[PDB]
Amino acid sequence: FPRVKNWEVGSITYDTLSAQAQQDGPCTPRRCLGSLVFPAPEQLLSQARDFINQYYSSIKRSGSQAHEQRLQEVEAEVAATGTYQLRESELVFGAKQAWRNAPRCVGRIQWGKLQVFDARDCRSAQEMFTYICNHIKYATNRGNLRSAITVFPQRCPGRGDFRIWNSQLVRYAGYRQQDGSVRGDPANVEITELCIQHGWTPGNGRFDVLPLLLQAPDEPPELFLLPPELVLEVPLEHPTLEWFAALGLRWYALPAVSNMLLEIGGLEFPAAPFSGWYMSTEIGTRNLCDPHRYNILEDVAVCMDLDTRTTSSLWKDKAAVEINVAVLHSYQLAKVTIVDHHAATASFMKHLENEQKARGGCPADWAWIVPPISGSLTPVFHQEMVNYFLSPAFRYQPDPW
Template identity: 45%
Template sequence: MPRPAVTGDVPPQLRLPPVTSTDDETTTFDLDGAESFLRMFHIAHPEAGPVGPRLAQVRDEVAATGTYRHTADELSYGARIALRDSGWCTSGVPWRRLKVRDLRGLRNAAAVAGECAEHLRLACHDGGIRPLVTVFAPDTPTAPGPCVWNEQLVRYAGYADGLGDRRYTAFTEAVRGMGWRPPAEPGRFDVLPLVVETAHEGAQLFTVPPEVVREVRLEHPDLPWFGDLGLRWHAVPVISNMRLCVGGVTYPAAPFNSWFVGSEIGTRSLADEHACGAAREVAEALGLDTTTERSLWRDRAAVELNRAVLHSFDLARVTITDHHSESRHRLSWLRSRQRPAGNRPAFRLDPAAARRARAGGPARFTPHPAETTRPQSPGRLAELLRRRAEG
């Protein structure tokens, strides 16, 4: 049965105004995106009533403030559609029932970091991964929103001698220059601090509380020695440096998660020599010839690493999917997804945000010369979590 249509043509007086200029500076607010999104929302949710009055309300709000505030239902719908259409929603994720945490009132770095830790705790859910989106304060004409530098909330340090995750060597050096200190004996899986930047505080460091970082130690179903390699990986992939764009409004900090695809860990993170580089030691333990690429030792090692990842996550009862299942899901998604459009809700990655996640800069905002950046104590976030749990 077709859905009810949105009430007829909207009278001209209720349509959103065109983009205008003020003091020779063009307004950056996407009015077309706002109107398209609101129409889309009201078609999907006829119980919200006719779109005309809402467009009139938004027209007045944009005229008065230069932006508008989404209702809770609009925000939830926009975030879910953005995740569905982005391609980041792994197979089996019930995107219509995704939990959207509306934290648009938070602009201070400590509060954002504390709720990022809470996101990790809630998402893990004793291994049965819960897909979540946490939305912080948006950019407005008067107050830009916060941003998280890290690519994911949990990433491992990379050191100049090749120890750890080499993808984040530059980021590790940057946060060390900002005040972070690695363990006395650096290891392969040292969790990097969160870097949260706000316009009024600059970039701030926060230790991720160990109690919210669920990790899975890797063992192999057929190779008893595999566990002695000491490999492990974190349970929840929370992408944290993409901005959420919904109806002309940009939320620069909107961490979201589904669950891992096994090959993302086994092949791209553990096996790759530009990441953790574990393929060689696995190949040597298997007795493979690593002096020539024609022995395909990298491929054989990657297969065993991927087997170990899937086996270990299943053993720990942590949700994960394999790359074959995911390939079928992606093909189905490509066939059925909406065609790209600039005004549809989306998660987007800016080039500058991608550089911050790997190189530890450039800063989104120019810090005040008097500002200093110091790592916050791990107890501070732990205390925030305890207070929330008690409340």
């Protein structure tokens, strides 16, 4: 039973939930690989067995009539068809637990407040687009963002997968350039090509929203433009540095991840986009200041009068703090939900306390929970954590191309 200490306070707990980690991960006693980014009817039955047990525990009906019935049921359907079907309530629970179990998500204090949209009757790439537009519209909610997930038909024997090819519903083009560079966001160079290759007329700005590439089973991907008024965006300004609006920077309101696989009781939903709201450091630090992304740090620092000839002046740390201030002010000026790394990490500490009393522990990836600026100023820096994989879960999956 791993003993875990908080160093700010001195307190100590033991992560007994870790001892039930099912699917296994990348470390051995020889070597830790925690820092790596990307590390049969009988088994479907025992996964499904396990999830059903979970679900009946969470409704306070373990060992009951309905419980054993549903086991008998699920086995009969795997025997007859090779798969089975989630009931709707079971689906809502399995998607909430997936969020709860996500080790690298700092936002998990909210895991119980999740709007689940059932798209499992979906039928083409065209219906898919309509369900997606509805999701974006419900979640954006004019800037008062809500947490939502839409679940498209499960992977099943005989038919291909639904897939969203875009890593997120809202992404900006990244055009490789004349002189070997990139206009727009360089993380989206590949999907940008794919879009042009599938009939998109490119733009040439730095913040061009990309069309959606949607894949119906056994179909090529289909291109869909998002209606402009569905994509709420936020012009970035700085409360005191007024030249900052002359950078022309923007970001969008809704973070909607769309390339992850949701696994519930052995079933796999390769298309199930989900969305919450941003933490300011994703936008301010990573998306804008990463050397391999928009890379605005030096330009801000020059403008700020800072001496960028020596690193001991800490120009990078200064410019980056003001970039974050701009991101929070901008989102509050526009009345668009946003959480800063101090509030986010503080409520994550509340999540670890709630979870220790509930399940005796909480899967957490320290290097992803700790923000990329001001780490030891947040309380999660001083919290030891145990990283492991519980099911239901969101998994990464390879790109459909």
